[PDB]
């Protein structure tokens, strides 16, 4: 059931905005690791005397980096007269924001019709305000509310490349990289209660749940045509294996955004590339399941995928599960940086045509019982 | 001249430590753009609760990259009972040394028969102390001292893989990668003013100086076998174009390591595998010059260097300079990271054969003149 509840008119993920010490290492490993090209900058050379931002993009996925410069270059500087093409950046933020979570998401940006109207709505529905709605060259408005912990959701809405004070990058330097990924499917944050972050999360957008051992209780909020998906999860103590979430937040200082979901438009081209580069620069993948998994994969996926392709997904340790409307390919990386707290999962769904509805599979929960369930069989 | 009047008994230089952000992501860019592998690591995995550090290796050179995980994990911890591989680490010096000056040199470690001794020495001929000597598992000592800026000298000595508490890396991990680099042939600091900093560094370690329109003026301190080089530059203040030291110290926020020039056994391999990787996640190099002063080689050089060895030069964009005793190729990067301050230079020396002579062919000052001279003949 979709109440179609939004209190303002939200289209689809922009952006996503680490918050680094050295953007220009960051971005290279993950441009190199992904198969993202350099898209745009804004830095010393393009005027920005407060910020290093570097987008990277593949398909309609966008990766932003930014890193604080001296705060000594813009000393003389005031908000209006500010060389930094994001207004709601500031040094003391960002550099809080790193000493205490380490490299991670600080903003999950999604396109509405109108920034100004939907911060208003937001903030007069519960949204705490982190950044008001500011224009920028009178063609984009960009406006920023509370997520979680210090993650902020950040809107942003065109009058009519990616922001004013944006170059784009050199053709010489911005190498065609491209391994198969092309949007972002979802992002999960990691909260120590679920409820009171479900109730404003929900509250301030309008954003419904969307129709559904591990260490978790989770939910996802959902926008009108359910393609923005914000997942949000909390801890079961008590467990014999201690939470993963849990460990999330102690090694985060609290809440912020654990894994963020990348849809690929050909699963086994993106983890062949990925897995390639794993040990040259790029990204590990956690540990595979027992070859059991598969064994167990033709009882119930046997009928969407064939036998060669299931093979497939037993060399590159891709996980599969399946709701009662779809089928899920998933496979999760190991953290992003030296913290045991972001990672990132490639994903492909497939079903759900009528375009490719929203969630379609679910988002692979099932894959808790699959692998328990395998391992004992490992073993016996 | 050489008076050989170390006033402790120094090796080679060891490793150089990067105090960074995020370890992972700058030690993958880097292993990736420079071609070296991972070798050890202390960190989460191996009980360090303290910082997370990642060693690199090519040939002898080491590049070490540390940065703190949470206070928080740590808390309960005295220095009596520290996890931290490195007890000379410490999360508000290292938090303090990024946000001031980005991506950057801590320490340049070099090797030496006692470091305690070579510490006493040091402090006692005005050194200023900045950790004490610490023996490690009763088999490594280490202490540090200031050397300028924030840039500690850091003293390692083995009664007798790297230090105790590092662990070296999974093979499966540990790809073997190689460009060529084979060892560190010299660190160089810009400072304010040359005069005092050179008194102090020349005072504590008994170094001499090593027999040698750019914006600066410069001098090298040398041990006794003149295989430990500490070149030191001060700008050239109200020239026509503003000094690079100038505009480093700027952006630095003051004195620090400007440069790591590295030795490569094959410079023209080393060049042509780092240029595959500027683009895809490696390091860009400094504008080529122009074809003139290839063009003015044959006459420099034309008695060490083939037609089709200077050809190859021209390609890959390589400078060449020359002393009395040898010959120089040398090669900038771009800055290593967001800020305009610290880069590499790759190396390589001909001549001076008895093994090689430290310093043989000198460190590229002629090339100042020879770029001037070709800019303007390009011209004409
Ligand atoms: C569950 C879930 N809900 N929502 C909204 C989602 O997006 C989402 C997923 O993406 C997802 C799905 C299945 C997973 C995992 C995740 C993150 C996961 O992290 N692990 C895991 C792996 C290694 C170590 C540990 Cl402790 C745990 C798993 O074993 N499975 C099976
Ligand atoms: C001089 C020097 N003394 N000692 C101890 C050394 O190690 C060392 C060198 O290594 C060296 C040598 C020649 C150089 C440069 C360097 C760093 C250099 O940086 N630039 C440069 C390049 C781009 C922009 C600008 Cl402004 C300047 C040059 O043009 N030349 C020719
Ligand atoms: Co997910
Ligand atoms: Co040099």
Not at 81 to 105: K, M, N, Q, W
Not at 177 to 182: P, S
Not at 295 to 310: A, E, F
């Amino acid at each position: 059931k979709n109440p179609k509840s939004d209190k303002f008119k939200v289209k689809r993920f922009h952006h996503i905005e680490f918050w680094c010490g050295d953007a220009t290492n960051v971005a290279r490993r993950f441009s190199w690791g992904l198969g993202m090209r350099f898209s745009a900058k804004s830095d010393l050379s393009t005027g920005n005397m407060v910020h290093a931002s570097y987008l990277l993009t593949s398909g309609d996925l966008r990766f932003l980096f930014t890193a604080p410069y001296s705060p000594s270059l813009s000393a003389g500087e005031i908000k209006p007269t500010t060389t930094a093409s994001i207004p709601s950046f500031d040094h003391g933020s960002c550099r809080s924001f790193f000493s205490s979570h380490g490299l991670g998401v600080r903003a999950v940006a999604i396109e509405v019709e109108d920034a100004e109207s939907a911060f208003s709505i937001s903030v007069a529905n519960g949204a705490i305000p982190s950044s008001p709605p500011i224009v920028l060259n009178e063609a984009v408005t960009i406006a920023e509310v509370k997520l979680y912990g210090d993650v902020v959701l950040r809107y942003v809405s065109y009058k009519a490349e990616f922001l004013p004070g944006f170059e784009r990058v050199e053709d010489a330097s911005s190498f065609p990289l491209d391994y198969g990924i092309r949007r972002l499917d979802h992002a999960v944050g990691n909260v120590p209660e679920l409820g009171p972050a479900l109730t404003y999360v929900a509250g301030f957008t309008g954003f419904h749940q969307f129709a559904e051992e591990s260490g978790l209780n989770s939910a996802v909020l959902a926008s009108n045509d359910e393609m923005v998906l914000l997942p949000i999860n909390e801890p079961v103590h008590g467990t014999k294996r201690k939470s993963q979430i849990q460990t999330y937040l102690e090694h985060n200082e609290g809440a912020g955004l654990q894994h963020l979901a990348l849809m690929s438009e050909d699963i086994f081209r993106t983890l062949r590339e990925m897995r390639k580069r794993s040990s040259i620069g790029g990204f590990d993948f956690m540990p595979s399941p027992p070859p059991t998994y598969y064994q167990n994969l033709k009882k119930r996926v046997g009928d969407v995928l064939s036998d060669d392709q299931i093979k497939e997904c037993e060399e590159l340790g891709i996980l599969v599960d399946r709701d009662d409307q779809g089928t899920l390919l998933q496979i999760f990386t190991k953290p992003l940086g030296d913290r045991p707290t972001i990672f990132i999962e490639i994903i492909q769904r497939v079903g759900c045509m009528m375009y490719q509805s929203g969630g379609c599979g679910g988002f692979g929960k099932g894959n808790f019982s699959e692998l328990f369930k395998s391992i004992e069989e490992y073993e016996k």
